[PDB]
Design a protein around this ligand. Structure first.
Ligand SMILES: NC(=O)c1ccc[n+]([C@@H]2O[C@H](COP(=O)([O-])OP(=O)(O)OC[C@H]3O[C@@H](n4cnc5c(N)ncnc54)[C@H](OP(=O)(O)O)[C@@H]3O)[C@@H](O)[C@H]2O)c1
Ligand SMILES: N[C@@H](CCC(=O)O)C(=O)O
Length: 415
């Protein structure tokens, strides 16, 4: 189970910090769980009822935040674990947010556009009483995009009778309706800032160094592109779920994306040697950025990693055994919920823009993301040095300490 795995992670974290038993018990349970029925009328005229969730783990630091998943395998346990994870994610990067998560047990592939809009509007009508600009801010997630976010915001504004900032009730919206710039490259930009800070900490100059990326979706492609331009690095290996390519002199991510668009995959790229993911993970490269399916670095290949920095852009792509093995080699790891925290920071920026009624630009959003990511990385690294623990442990310590301090300040826990 995912919620048990999350709870265990929290206990393991609490082992390295001084936290009261009552606070741990409080943090082991979501503060509010809402399970609703989401009825929509289909194209054939029949009415089908779906199961929707909205978990608000903790709101000591402020309104909860988290996306909505439309997955046929959604469970309450998954939503609860992801909300718990979102709490620490927003706490490590110092946002005035709590942890939240929603989901609908639905296969969105079998739904038409009209049915998808009806599902979004019905979900908003079902969970209206627990969401709001200052209560709970949903966001795009697996199988949800900005189109669904716009439909959801419109339904919320219709119910809300335009009595306040209905734009800020949800993030990831289209630019025409409370849209925020930088929302396509948020995760990659945050990962690049964290990689730059890690290289600064290790004393490595990234100008001309090597990078390898696993997974060539939005995150992987934009990570490679931003690395090559901003950090001046030599992209030598990229890979999708199909296969990988290698070229020591350097690859051009734009051309690789064009090839992927044409032939359907990065396989057989001209001037490059076709390889598989497993050997791709073991090239002698300065930094490694797994941006693909989780649990790629395990005990089987942990000792074979030759990268000086491993940036876990993906969601937990490294197992704890591989974590210990990599730390034993001196390889610096950026924790998964610290590396890809650029997505929630830009969502916070979007919420601020919506609340204020004044939107920013591309340079403004990029400048702020730099500040937030640099400060979060330095906080985690300072905890890393002071407590002499793992990088992932330090991030948990920082997040749980912030949430615990907020809880103590409100008087929720007296000790
Ligand atoms: O979400 P997101 O925007 O971050 O990315 P994404 O666009 O949703 O896609 C995930 C990326 O990781 C790749 N991927 C999925 N399973 C993989 C595997 N087992 N091995 C290697 N690459 C894999 C995908 O390749 P594919 O597009 O080929 O599935 C894609 O490049
Ligand atoms: N991190 C989740 C949701 C958080 C947010 O964007 O507000 C996502 O990938 O969308």
């Amino acid at each position: 189970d995912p919620f048990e795995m999350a709870v265990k992670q929290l206990e393991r974290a609490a082992q390295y910090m001084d936290i009261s038993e009552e606070a741990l018990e409080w943090l082991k349970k979501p503060m509010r769980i809402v399970e609703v029925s989401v009825p929509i009328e289909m194209d054939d005229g029949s009415v089908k009822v779906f199961t929707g969730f909205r978990v608000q783990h903790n709101w000591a630091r402020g309104p909860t935040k988290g996306g909505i998943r439309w997955h046929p395998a959604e469970t309450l346990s998954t939503v609860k674990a992801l909300a718990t994870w979102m709490t620490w994610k927003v706490a490590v990067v110092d946002l005035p947010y709590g942890g939240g998560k929603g989901g609908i047990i639905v296969n969105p592939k079998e739904l038409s556009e009209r049915e998808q809009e009806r599902l979004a509007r019905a979900y908003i009508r079902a969970v209206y009483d627990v969401i709001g600009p200052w209560t709970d801010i949903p966001a795009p997630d697996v199988y949800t995009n900005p189109k669904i976010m716009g439909w959801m915001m419109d339904e919320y504004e219709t119910i809300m009778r335009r009595k306040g900032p209905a734009f800020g009730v949800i993030t990831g919206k289209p630019l025409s309706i409370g849209g925020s710039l930088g929302r396509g490259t948020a995760t990659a930009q945050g990962a690049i800032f964290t990689i730059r800070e890690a290289a600064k900490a290790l004393g490595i100059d990234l100008k001309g160094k090597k990078i390898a990326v696993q997974g060539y979706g939005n995150a992987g492609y934009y990570t490679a592109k931003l690395a090559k331009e901003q950090l001046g690095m030599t992209v030598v290996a990229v890979s999708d779920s199909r296969g990988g390519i290698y070229n020591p002199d350097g690859l051009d991510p734009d051309e690789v994306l064009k090839w992927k668009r044409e032939h359907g995959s990065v396989k057989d790229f001209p001037g490059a040697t076709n390889i598989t993911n497993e050997e791709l993970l073991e090239l002698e490269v300065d930094v490694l950025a797994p941006a693909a399916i989780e649990e790629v670095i395990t005990e089987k290949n942990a000792d074979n990693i030759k990268a000086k920095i491993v940036a876990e852009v993906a969601n937990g792509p490294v197992t704890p055994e591989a974590d210990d093995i990599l730390r034993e080699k001196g390889i610096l790891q950026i924790p998964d919920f610290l590396c890809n925290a650029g997505g929630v920071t830009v969502s916070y920026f979007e919420w601020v823009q919506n609340i204020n009624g004044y939107y920013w630009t591309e340079e403004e959003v990029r400048e702020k993301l730099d500040k937030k990511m640099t400060k979060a990385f330095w906080e985690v690294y300072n905890t890393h040095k002071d407590k002499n623990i793992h990088m992932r442990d330090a991030a948990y310590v920082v997040a749980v300490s912030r949430v615990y301090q907020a809880m103590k300040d409100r008087g929720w826990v007296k000790k």
